[PDB]
Design an enzyme around this catalytic site. Structure first.
Site, PDB file in Angstrom:
ATOM      1  N   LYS A  66       1.487  -1.127  -0.353  1.00 17.29           N
ATOM      2  CA  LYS A  66       0.398   0.207   0.364  1.00 17.29           C
ATOM      3  C   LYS A  66       0.917   0.977  -0.049  1.00 17.29           C
ATOM      4  CE  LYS A  66      -3.051  -3.089   1.311  1.00 17.29           C
ATOM      5  NZ  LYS A  66      -2.665  -4.636   1.313  1.00 17.29           N
ATOM      6  N   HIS A  83       1.848   8.392  -0.474  1.00 17.49           N
ATOM      7  CA  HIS A  83       1.967   9.481  -1.955  1.00 17.49           C
ATOM      8  C   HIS A  83       3.182  10.014  -2.212  1.00 17.49           C
ATOM      9  CE1 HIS A  83       3.368  11.802   1.898  1.00 17.49           C
ATOM     10  NE2 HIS A  83       3.659  12.651   0.300  1.00 17.49           N
ATOM     11  N   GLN A  88      13.469   7.096   6.658  1.00 20.01           N
ATOM     12  CA  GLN A  88      12.136   6.665   6.838  1.00 20.01           C
ATOM     13  C   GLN A  88      10.823   6.965   5.609  1.00 20.01           C
ATOM     14  OE1 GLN A  88      10.946   8.297  10.664  1.00 20.01           O
ATOM     15  NE2 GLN A  88      12.399   6.706  11.977  1.00 20.01           N
ATOM     16  N   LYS A 105      11.653   4.568   1.036  1.00 14.01           N
ATOM     17  CA  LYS A 105      12.515   4.408  -0.147  1.00 14.01           C
ATOM     18  C   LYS A 105      13.300   2.908  -0.798  1.00 14.01           C
ATOM     19  CE  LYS A 105      16.176   3.157   1.932  1.00 14.01           C
ATOM     20  NZ  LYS A 105      17.981   4.149   2.006  1.00 14.01           N
ATOM     21  N   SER A 106      13.343   2.037   1.045  1.00 10.90           N
ATOM     22  CA  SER A 106      13.372   0.815   0.425  1.00 10.90           C
ATOM     23  C   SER A 106      12.528  -0.274  -0.782  1.00 10.90           C
ATOM     24  CB  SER A 106      13.744  -0.051   1.333  1.00 10.90           C
ATOM     25  OG  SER A 106      15.298   0.426   2.133  1.00 10.90           O
ATOM     26  N   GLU A 111      21.772   5.280  -1.129  1.00  5.03           N
ATOM     27  CA  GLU A 111      22.292   6.125  -0.321  1.00  5.03           C
ATOM     28  C   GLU A 111      23.222   6.273  -1.795  1.00  5.03           C
ATOM     29  OE1 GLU A 111      21.500   7.939   2.184  1.00  5.03           O
ATOM     30  OE2 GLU A 111      20.104   6.589   1.004  1.00  5.03           O
TER      31      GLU A 111
END
EC number: 3.6.4.-
Length: 250
Positions: A14, A17, A37, A40-41, A147
């Site tokens: 899920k 935005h 947080q 991204k992963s 990164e």
């Protein structure tokens, strides 16, 4: 084609935005300057899983400054891939955890049926910027840079970029910013959100058509955590705060 809502439901995913903005983009160079947080992963891992199943034969890498950092996203791609293969009877997953290598074999029929012939194989590898030697080229349909601001530009320009251009593959280039280096330049080539604090030359910058850039501070993804973030400034040096959470180029 891009991953759909239907495909997200198969993954139990899920998106928020920002993640969604990234998935909807069709830019061959996507650059995301996000705070910790940000999700991204996950969004990266979801992109890899899609390619492997929807483009049989596709080959991609995820590279990070260290093998330990790369293992994060790679591990999430493994979980998702292995679980998802259950609803694709004509696939069979193969894993080599030590080499950070993941294979998705596609068959001309369901694997559990007699006479099954292997038609195509998709490959995904984890790579490390501090192990240049293990970056012997491959024909990539896609690549994730995690990164990225801490990966030397040379790794992009010499070991990654050229192979992508072969199969006209895409790159998802993610990072928390680390000053005004190559990652900042790339961000700017795709930034269309106008003037914003933390982004020098925004609002007057040029953009390349193949580039799309995304930006979000931690507290943009987690508004209810803003006060906590702000109150960490008491023991976090200001510049570390502005970058890791504020996503600022400094």
């Amino acid at each position: 084609l891009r991953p759909s809502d239907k495909f997200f439901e198969l993954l139990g995913y899920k998106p928020h935005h920002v993640q969604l903005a990234i998935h909807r983009s069709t830019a061959k160079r996507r650059v995301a300057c996000l705070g910790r947080q940000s999700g991204k992963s996950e969004a990266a891992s979801v992109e890899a899983v899609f390619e492997l199943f929807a483009r049989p034969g596709s080959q991609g890498w995820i590279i990070a400054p260290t093998y330990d950092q790369a293992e994060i996203i790679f591990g999430r791609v493994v979980e998702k891939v292995e679980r998802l293969a259950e609803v694709f009877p004509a696939t069979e997953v193969q894993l080599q955890r030590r080499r950070l290598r993941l294979l998705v074999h596609h068959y001309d029929r369901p694997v559990n049926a007699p006479g099954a012939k292997r038609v195509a194989t998709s490959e995904f590898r984890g790579k490390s910027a501090d192990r240049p030697d293990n970056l012997a080229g491959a024909t990539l349909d896609f690549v994730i840079l995690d990164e990225a601001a801490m990966i030397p530009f040379s790794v992009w320009s010499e070991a990654i970029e050229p192979t992508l251009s072969v199969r006209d593959g895409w790159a998802l280039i993610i990072s928390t910013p680390k000053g005004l280096n190559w990652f900042y330049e790339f961000f700017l080539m795709g930034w269309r959100g106008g003037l914003k604090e933390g982004i020098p030359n925004s609002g007057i910058n040029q953009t390349h058509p193949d580039f799309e850039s995304f930006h979000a501070a931690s507290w943009d993804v987690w508004p209810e955590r803003r006060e906590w973030y702000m109150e960490r400034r008491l023991y976090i040096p200001d510049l570390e705060f502005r970058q890791e959470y504020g996503a600022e180029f400094v």
